[PDB]
Amino acid sequence: SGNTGSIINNYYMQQYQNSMDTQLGDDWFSKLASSAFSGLFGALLA
Amino acid sequence: SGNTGSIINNYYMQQYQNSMDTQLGDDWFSKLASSAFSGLFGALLA
Amino acid sequence: RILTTRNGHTTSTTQSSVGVTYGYATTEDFVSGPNTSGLETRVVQAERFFKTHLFDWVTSDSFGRCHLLELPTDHKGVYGSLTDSYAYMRNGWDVEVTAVGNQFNGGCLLVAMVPELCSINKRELYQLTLFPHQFINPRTNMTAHITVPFVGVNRYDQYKVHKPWTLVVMVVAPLTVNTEGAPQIKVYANIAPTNVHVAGEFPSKE
Amino acid sequence: GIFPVACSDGYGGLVTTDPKTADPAYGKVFNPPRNMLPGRFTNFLDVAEACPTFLRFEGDVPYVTTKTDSDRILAQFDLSLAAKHMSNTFLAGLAQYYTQYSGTINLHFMFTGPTDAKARYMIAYAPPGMEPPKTPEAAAHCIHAEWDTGLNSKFTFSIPYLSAADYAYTASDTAETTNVQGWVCLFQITHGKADGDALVVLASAGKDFELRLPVDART
Amino acid sequence: GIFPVACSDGYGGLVTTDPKTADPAYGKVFNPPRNMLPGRFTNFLDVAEACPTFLRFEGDVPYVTTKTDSDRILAQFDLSLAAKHMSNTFLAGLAQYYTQYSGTINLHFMFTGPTDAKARYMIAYAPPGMEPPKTPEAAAHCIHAEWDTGLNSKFTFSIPYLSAADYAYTASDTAETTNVQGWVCLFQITHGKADGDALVVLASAGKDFELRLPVDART
Amino acid sequence: TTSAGESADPVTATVENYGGETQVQRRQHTDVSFILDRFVKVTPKDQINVLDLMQTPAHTLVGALLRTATYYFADLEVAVKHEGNLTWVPNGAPETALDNTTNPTAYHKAPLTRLALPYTAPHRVLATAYNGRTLPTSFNYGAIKATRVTELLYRMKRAETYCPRPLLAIHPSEARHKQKIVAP
Amino acid sequence: TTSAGESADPVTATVENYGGETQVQRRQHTDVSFILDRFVKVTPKDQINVLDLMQTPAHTLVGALLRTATYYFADLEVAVKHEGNLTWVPNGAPETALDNTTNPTAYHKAPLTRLALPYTAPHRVLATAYNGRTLPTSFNYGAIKATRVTELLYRMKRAETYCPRPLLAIHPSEARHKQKIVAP
């Protein structure tokens, strides 16, 4: 996902190559940047 | 089955990699633990 | 621009609001995890405003002059007693900072909520806006309002040994009085703990 | 031509715990049948759950005796798999080979006095951050259970996992003066002619007890 | 027989930035859950866009003050991520780890004077190839914007990316006497009783600001 | 674009305001996972080395960028030059374990050893700052030991970052920070 | 939870008894096959080495855990550092066979030899204790020989364990057994 560029599947199982994430029950900054006001606050002439 | 993590089939036959089991004609402790009493022996108030 | 905020049986109304800044999230993360084994409970009675004076903004204060308030702070109400009755806690903060002078004062304050603040250096103040914040500019407003959730490497904390949040107020442009403005501006904070959960009841002192 | 390959530096050394198998040399051996031998166990925690083992108290005994004096503390020890009180249990024997754990630890109490001896006990869990309670009245405010003697001689209580982090350490650091995970406090509320009678206590793993991160530290 | 292979010269050495992964040694570890923790960021430019930071002016302050004199220049600096004026911004902090960039840089101006202080400002972009303008009249012929104070205290202006090549360097070469990318010129057209009042300025990345070619040069 | 500056709601003006045109941008190089996913050198101790990302020098690309996150998560890779066998031990292990070979031990193989290690801390996430200067001892990725370690490099895998913090460039004494740029 | 303590039927109380909630548990690390499936060092003899799992030191992870089983089964792997060629011989072989090369013999190849060997005993299963201290001589995995063996490591494969036995931790002199834990 980061700086990896092999087209073949890793020889070892995922369970060994990395730690495994568990669940309970750019996210925030991406939403913040996307919500930015990008116009003019007033009336526009020509 | 234990601490093995290769996704590819072993190059050698099973008959060579390991000894072969034969049949005749966590088992016990798993059953014992699963059968454990886990409640209250009496009457419960609120 | 009237805003009324309610936390429990306490309300605060402002007629010079610039809105409220929500930091890092709109809602809290899971409150019931494996570290409390289902023994945690919510204490609604503590979710109310408590007050404290921060500092007096004077004309001699120059850029960078700041005031820090680690949270949680000394609390003599129910929230405070919770820290003596339970080993583990978590809560967010609803923060309102006030700096009342008049519209003839000039200058500007930046108020921010910063996580894990173990002192900040001079050059870093130039980037204090990376944290949840809002400005107090006399020509426009007298109130800053910020709301943040609980954060930390642990789902629950031990406030006696760790303070996840630090409220910081910094002077960005020095205060000006110009004949008709207020001679100085006292800065106050009105804070309310949010979604407080506790776990692990302590014994008494008897 | 033939397949070109890059023998990579930093790979290939023997790792004592690697996930691959050695090449074989002696094939086709068939083993004597061994299906359905009794007493098999496949996970160490199943036996830790099913077989509670004895705690150790002052004097090298698995019990505490009822006393007659204003002091009602029967036992008070650090909730730690490295505690002297737990040092002879199977649970502690297993825990030494892992660095972390979470979950419930069950304590079992069995009254051994004669039929005309009665008593009432209290077990409490005091969390870290404040000194443990010295009296039953002070301990009442902690998570606790009280029970008396009768037809059923045994009582079992679950010590809860309560901590800031999701896992706790099995070992105790030398720079750790006050126990990190709290104390278990066993009190005697009162008794009726039970002087000198023994209450034996055992410990077993609870349903969600978990050990992780194997480690060989000697011991 | 077995598969013949050619161990190739020139391949296989460790490269500090290679696209492959190491062999594992310690398997099956499950992490504590961490889904939906607040404040996550996945790209450094999202925060550079969303969080403008302060510029630095003579005297170590983030503002420029209105003046009363024939000189109407409030500030004039090299459009360079290596400029002293930008040295305390998040944008410059990020830019030092890349060799090239393109796209828009936004400047924000916030008036801080009292309600009875008024002013009119002008921001202009002077391209390379001619000395930057010293007066508002001369700068009028450049791309520019003028605005005054009022109910809204803030004004934002996009400094355009204009160059012969598609990318510009983030660093400034020592043999580079005249700025390669031009100058930003902040003027004061006039003011009404705003003597000594501060205009604070911040900078943030624009919608098409882009950094490429990571580099570790110390700093 | 005028707006209420006291607000903090992000405002992003564009060149369209004066007739320009916003272009396309490709930001793969500023992606968090991508940029942190590379080796960084650390000065090692002769034998026992606790794996701790805060050992990265603060001015390096990896060190600086890691410090702009207050909380982070990542699996790890290490490349080590060492004499004798290299033994790794997980977070929470007694120091004494560093001498026992059943713990992941790599037998010497020139010129160095590269290993993939899992996150092993008891916390859901780690931090680069902790208000409790000094970080809790549980903030580590275990420890390694060999007869002598000569080089140690860290590489963050699957990195996640939360709550940005200040990132400072060099402060110039002149109007611009000038450096000799590579040229023929 | 009250019950008849004399019975021996397992009793497992839960935190639900006082309003708590039992969590999820993952026990892969205490799985028998998994935990024993790793190399453990043994001190070798100069030339003839009978392969015997009881040579594992009793305090080691593998040694201790193996001894908690009275009966066990497993295939084997060995890693050996040796001079000259290494010859292995099966269970029941005359010692003299150790010098004949037609028996599995590995020619020297730096830095060591790793071999997978099958269970070879005449019994359906082996034991760590035998009431007949001393174990029957037929309890072995054959023997190896080389001009000089410098290192010998055992690794149990497909392990099976029957009838648990005592597993003892260290007995502390103080209230707790304290150890220096790895820390930055």
Automatic annotation (TrEMBL), chains A, B:
Signal peptide extent: none
Cellular location(s): Host cytoplasm; Virion
Function statement: Lies on the inner surface of the capsid shell. After binding to the host receptor, the capsid undergoes conformational changes. Capsid protein VP4 is released, capsid protein VP1 N-terminus is externalized, and together, they shape a pore in the host membrane through which the viral genome is translocated into the host cell cytoplasm. After genome has been released, the channel shrinks.
Name recorded for this polypeptide: Genome polyprotein
Full-protein interval shown: 216 to 286 of 936
TrEMBL record, chain C:
Organism: Foot-and-mouth disease virus serotype O (FMDV)
Segments forming domain Picornavirus capsid: 13-176
Functional note: Lies on the inner surface of the capsid shell. After binding to the host receptor, the capsid undergoes conformational changes. Capsid protein VP4 is released, capsid protein VP1 N-terminus is externalized, and together, they shape a pore in the host membrane through which the viral genome is translocated into the host cell cytoplasm. After genome has been released, the channel shrinks.
The organism's taxonomic lineage, starting at the top: Viruses, Riboviria, Orthornavirae, Pisuviricota, Pisoniviricetes
Span within the parent record: 98 to 303 of 734
Highest taxon listed in the record's lineage: Viruses
Record's protein name: Genome polyprotein
Intracellular or extracellular location(s): Host cytoplasm; Virion
From TrEMBL, chains D, E:
Domain Picornavirus capsid: 32-186
Protein name: Genome polyprotein
Entry function: Lies on the inner surface of the capsid shell. After binding to the host receptor, the capsid undergoes conformational changes. Capsid protein VP4 is released, capsid protein VP1 N-terminus is externalized, and together, they shape a pore in the host membrane through which the viral genome is translocated into the host cell cytoplasm. After genome has been released, the channel shrinks.
Location(s), subcellular: Host cytoplasm; Virion
Organism of origin: Foot-and-mouth disease virus serotype O (FMDV)
Superkingdom of origin: Viruses
Automatic annotation (TrEMBL), chains F, G:
Chain ranges of the Picornavirus capsid domain: 1-132
Superkingdom, natural source: Viruses
Compartment list: Host cytoplasm; Virion
Signal peptide as annotated in the record: none
Role, per record: Lies on the inner surface of the capsid shell. After binding to the host receptor, the capsid undergoes conformational changes. Capsid protein VP4 is released, capsid protein VP1 N-terminus is externalized, and together, they shape a pore in the host membrane through which the viral genome is translocated into the host cell cytoplasm. After genome has been released, the channel shrinks.
The protein's name in its UniProt record: Genome polyprotein
Organism: Foot-and-mouth disease virus serotype O
Lineage: Viruses, Riboviria, Orthornavirae, Pisuviricota, Pisoniviricetes
